RNA sequence: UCUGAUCGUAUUGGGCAUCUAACCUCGAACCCUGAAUCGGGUUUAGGGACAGUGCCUGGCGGGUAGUUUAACUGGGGCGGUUGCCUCCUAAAAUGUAACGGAGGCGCCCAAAGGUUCCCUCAACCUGGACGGCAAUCAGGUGGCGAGUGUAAAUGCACAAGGGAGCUUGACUGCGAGACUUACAAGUCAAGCAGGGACGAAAGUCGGGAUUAGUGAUCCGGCACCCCCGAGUGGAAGGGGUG
RNA sequence: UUGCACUACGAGUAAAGAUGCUCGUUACGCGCGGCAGGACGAAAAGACCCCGGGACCUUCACUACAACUUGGUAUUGAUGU
RNA sequence: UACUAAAAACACAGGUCCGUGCGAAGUCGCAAGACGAUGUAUACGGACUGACGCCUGCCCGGUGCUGGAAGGUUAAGAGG
RNA sequence: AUGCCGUGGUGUAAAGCGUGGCAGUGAGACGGCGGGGGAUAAGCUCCGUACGUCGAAAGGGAAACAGCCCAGAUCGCCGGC
RNA sequence: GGGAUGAGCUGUGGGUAGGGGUGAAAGGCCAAUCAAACUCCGUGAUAGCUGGUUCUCCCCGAAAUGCAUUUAGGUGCAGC
RNA sequence: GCCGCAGCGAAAGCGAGUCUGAAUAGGGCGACCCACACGCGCAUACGCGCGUGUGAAUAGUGGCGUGUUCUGGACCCGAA
RNA sequence: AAUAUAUAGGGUGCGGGAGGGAACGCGGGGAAGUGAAACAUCUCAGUACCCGUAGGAGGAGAAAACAAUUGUGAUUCCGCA
């Protein structure tokens, strides 16, 4: 910047560390289970890959934004809190 | 070859979910006795990089 | 001549406040009633 | 040689909102040293005598026993 | 068998002295050697666990090597100056240069802060033991000429000036909205909750009449919170908040 | 050496010292031999000064190293006191 | 000072100081080795003065150089 | 007096503002007016001016004459004001 | 013009090499070059500095100010 | 494998939310069509929440051109 | 041999080495200009250069390996991460 202390040395560093052992979760909403699977059924981790809602070879996690009216039977890692409420309200189940 | 990024700007800036760029504020690491709590709360948290520095900061992060 | 003293609590011994006094006008340790956020109420505070 | 030459920064004092001008609540009206103007209805003083606004309205100036005042008509 | 003393043995270090066998000798002789002031070997005369050399470590070190040694400036050097705060220049908003004109700051105060109540100053005049132009008293006059911890300007007699009572808001969690601004910073803030001070209440209080009394980042230090813990349980280290 | 060329002088004017611009005044066209006032004549990207870079030189500028020097340990052992 | 300086500059014989006891001190080399010198303090290396004559005063606080070790300060190793 | 800030009218195409791509500039010059430094000297120096021209603007005028006065060249004409 | 039996001059052969040599000492000389030779290579060294950068036309059109700067003939951001 | 598909937090973690905090207080960052009748406990009217759609407007990614930019000698020429 | 056991050495007889080559390979020594708008840590770069030594390729190569409660199973090389 011409001699004054630059913008990348005036400001302080962002606080914290990065977790070396952080486990990520790919994400599907429960309103996408409704649109992709309108008649319900067994919704596994492999059927969400092929229908184009989650990636390959990753831990999944079912969150709860949307309206679920289908009667699904969803199997996934690490369900949410508002997601179990909307799946069992439609008569389904939710196993790990 | 492949484009290197600036190691100092990646430790001082980051991006939000809609593409804004944020930073922390200065005058807070030491000499904190004479600074009243009306000043250390103004200097707390994060703000957005100002619109006149957003072009040099974008081309250091990328 | 005016050092920076710090005020530790009397119950939890947390060091909540920092201020300045005069060493020669006030040779002893200051005692003030200040709000302690750990206890949630006003306690006593000597120096360290 | 000289012993002069140093000055300070300019502090940008003065009336920041004139008469009849519609303000929002919290707006700095007359920044100054001391009480050149005094606070009136819906105007609070401030630490360094800054004379901000307490309620949205229009600024009007007047006299209240020799001291000239800033008020806000809600 | 505790405190102290002294004697003895064993095992270990440091001094001093002697020894020879490592090592040392450009002292001497002999052989390889026919030709050798080289080298090597044998023997002898001496030195001797020292010296020399390896590794570690202090010293000393322009002998040598790499470099640094600021800018403004009526040329450069010499002298001076560099950040902050107030005034004038500055042309009746704000801002405005010069090595233009004057001055302050790198603090101070545990009350000189917070609150509730109460008071009016300086100067002049008249009377009074020591007492004088001027100490304290008494009475007239006096609307700001005194005072403000500290420079100047803007304020302040409604007092922000003087005095007294109780006190710690010289708070923790925040902050709608603004000023100023290239950016970094700087500054003001109604109001909401916690737990308090003073007040009968209304209310006021996030230091000081206001603006100077200060230093970005990096790297660290300490206190606490228990967030991560390189297979696991811990720990070392790291992280947050002051 | 060389941007040109049928390349006057005076008083002005202009980047402040004009063959080239203004207003005048003077001068037939071309050579040859001489003199050196001007063409800011030619020659050398000023040696002075200043700003930036370099080199080499000095020291009680800084940070290093060789040389010299101290101690421990290794080579390195025995016996007395 | 070849190529703008031949001088009052350097050298010089004489002087004094300091170092050197002998594969010396000093120098050239990482070393071996070499010069010194086939020399041995009347010799050799360094520094300054510069034939000769008469002379060369006072100062050891500062900075060196030489000697000393009572005291303080001070490394690795040993100790743990 | 002007200047400045807000507002309600009236007028005005190539004004304003927010956000992206690519810049150049950061040596200024004289003249009008208000000032500082200078001797109320300078073709001097340093600031102010919704002031001008040159810079980056040709033409006409001031004899010549970047910066003064008139006026801003799209092209053509042997027309006019 | 100076020396010209001397510290003379000269021929032939040899030795000393680049932070080195050699120097009766001038920073002199080391192949017409020396306050550190020459040649190849690193190498197309770097230069906030000077020079240069080539065909056309149509629309619009600046700036020489602010703030910061080991900065003042450079540059970042704003202004245009 | 890369970019897109969910963000927030220093992180544990929670997830159309989340961090801060004592807070169902306020902020930060993130998400969220009422141009649309209708139906709903709406109604002086616009709305509130959710259906039905009248079937509203999001969107990325890979190639090839261009303008700048990064690392390379990087527009070309030139030192001591 | 000195000198005794013997060795150093010498006599004789068969093999082998030496030096060259444009690149590539392995092992060892190792810059500065430069970039950091100065500079020494750092960079330039284990680059340029030098030394030893090969082969038609060389080096590495048969777990005292990774991994994380499951597992992969010598090395080299190319693409990702
Ligand atoms: C100074 O005048 C002198 C002469 C330069 S020539 C104009 N400087 C050095 O010799
Ligand atoms: Mg900290
Ligand atoms: Mg604090
Ligand atoms: Mg006291
Ligand atoms: Mg001063
Ligand atoms: Mg001022
Ligand atoms: Mg040197
Ligand atoms: Mg260098
Ligand atoms: Mg200068
Ligand atoms: Mg001068
Ligand atoms: Mg003004
Ligand atoms: Mg004005
Ligand atoms: Mg009080
Ligand atoms: Mg008072
Ligand atoms: Mg304080
Ligand atoms: Mg806020
Ligand atoms: Mg309360
Ligand atoms: Mg009470
Ligand atoms: Mg308050
Ligand atoms: Mg204050
Ligand atoms: Mg004050
Ligand atoms: Mg740093
Ligand atoms: Mg572990
Ligand atoms: Mg810890
Ligand atoms: Mg906090
Ligand atoms: Mg003629
Ligand atoms: Mg003339
Ligand atoms: Mg003429
Ligand atoms: Mg002509
Ligand atoms: Mg002639
Ligand atoms: Mg001449
Ligand atoms: Mg000439
Ligand atoms: Mg020149
Ligand atoms: Mg010395
Ligand atoms: Mg000569
Ligand atoms: Mg010797
Ligand atoms: Mg002697
Ligand atoms: Mg001497
Ligand atoms: Mg002499
Ligand atoms: Mg002599
Ligand atoms: Mg002495
Ligand atoms: Mg633009
Ligand atoms: Mg500049
Ligand atoms: Mg300028
Ligand atoms: Mg100007
Ligand atoms: Mg004038
Ligand atoms: Mg001028
Ligand atoms: Mg120009
Ligand atoms: Mg013109
Ligand atoms: Mg124009
Ligand atoms: Mg004209
Ligand atoms: Mg004319
Ligand atoms: Mg003769
Ligand atoms: Mg003669
Ligand atoms: Mg003669
Ligand atoms: Mg020869
Ligand atoms: Mg020569
Ligand atoms: Mg050199
Ligand atoms: Mg290179
Ligand atoms: Mg170049
Ligand atoms: Mg135009
Ligand atoms: Mg600086
Ligand atoms: Mg720019
Ligand atoms: Mg994140
Ligand atoms: Mg929220
Ligand atoms: Mg070979
Ligand atoms: Mg280097
Ligand atoms: Mg550099
Ligand atoms: Mg450079
Ligand atoms: Mg072969
Ligand atoms: Mg092999
Ligand atoms: Zn407590």
DSSP string for chain A: --SS--HHHHSPPPP----TTPPP-EEEEHHHHHHH-TT-EEE-HHHHHHTTSS-SSS-EEEE--S---S-EEEE-SS--HHHHHHHHHTT-EEE-
How far apart are the C-alpha atoms of D35 and A81, rounded to whole Å? Answer: 59
Domain that holds residue C44: 1-48
Report CB contact under 8 Å: B32, C19: no
Cβ-contact A30, A64 below 8 angstroms? yes
Does nucleic acid strand H have an atom less than 7 angstroms from the CB of B59? no
**Distance, CA of C16 to CA of C22 (rounded, Å):** 20
Strand E, CB < 7 A, residues 8-37 of A: 9-13, 15-17, 19-21
The method of structure determination was cryo-EM
Residue A63 to residue A69: CA distance in whole angstroms: 15
For residues B50 and B25, the answer to whether their CB atoms sit within 8 Å is: no
Counting every residue, how long is chain B?
Answer: 62
User: Exposure of B12 by Cβ count < 10 A (0-12 exposed, 13-18 middle, 19+ buried)?
Assistant: buried
Question: What are the C-alpha distances in Å from D28 to residues A59, A82, C45, D11, D14?
Answer: 55, 47, 39, 14, 10
Residues with CB under 7 A from strand I: A 1-4; B 52-53, 55-56
User: Rounded to an integer, what distance in angstroms lies between the CA atom of residue A91 and that of residue A72?
Assistant: 8
Residue position matching structure tokens 């809609």: B18
Residue B23: exposure state from Cβ atoms within 10 A (0-12, 13-18, ≥19): buried
**What are the residue boundaries of the structural domains of chain B, listed by start?**
1-62
Q: Measured between CB atoms, does B61 come within 8 Å of chain A?
A: no
The helix (run of H) or strand (run of E) holding residue B40 is helix B37-40
Half-sphere exposure of D59 (CA within 13 A, CB side): 24
Q: CA-to-CA distance for D57 and C41, rounded, in angstroms?
A: 41
Pairwise CA distance, residues A36 & A34, whole Å:
6
Closest ligand to residue C37's CA: 72
The domain tally of chain C equals 1
CA distance A50 to A55: 9
């Amino acid at each position: 910047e011409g001699g004054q202390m630059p913008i990348h040395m005036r400001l302080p560093k962002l606080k914290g560390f990065r977790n070396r052992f952080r486990t990520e979760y790919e994400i599907v909403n429960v309103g996408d289970i409704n649109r992709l699977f309108p008649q319900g059924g067994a919704v596994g981790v492999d059927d969400l890959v092929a229908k184009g809602a989650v990636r390959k070879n990753a831990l999944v996690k079912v969150l709860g934004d949307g309206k679920l009216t289908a009667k699904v039977d969803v199997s996934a890692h690490k369900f949410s809190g508002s997601a179990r409420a909307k799946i069992t309200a439609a008569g389904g189940s939710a196993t790990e | 070859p492949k484009a290197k990024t600036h190691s100092g700007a990646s430790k001082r800036f980051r991006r939000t979910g809609t593409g804004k760029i944020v930073r922390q504020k200065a005058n807070r690491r030491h000499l904190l006795e004479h600074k009243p709590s009306t000043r250390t709360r103004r200097l707390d948290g994060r703000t957005v990089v100002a619109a006149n520095d957003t072009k040099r900061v974008t081309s250091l992060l990328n | 001549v005016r050092p920076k003293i710090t005020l530790a609590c009397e119950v939890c011994k947390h060091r909540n406040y920092i201020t300045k006094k005069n060493r020669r006008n006030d040779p002893d340790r200051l005692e003030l009633k200040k709000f302690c956020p750990n206890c949630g109420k006003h306690q006593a505070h000597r120096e360290t | 040689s000289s012993r002069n030459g140093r000055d300070s920064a300019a502090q940008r004092l003065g009336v920041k909102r004139y008469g009849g001008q519609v303000v929002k609540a919290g707006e700095i009206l007359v920044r100054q040293r001391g009480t050149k103007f005094h606070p009136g209805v819906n105007v609070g003083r401030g630490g360094d005598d800054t004379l901000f606004a307490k309620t949205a309205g229009a600024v009007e100036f007047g006299i209240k026993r020799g001291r000239k005042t800033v008020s806000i008509v809600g």
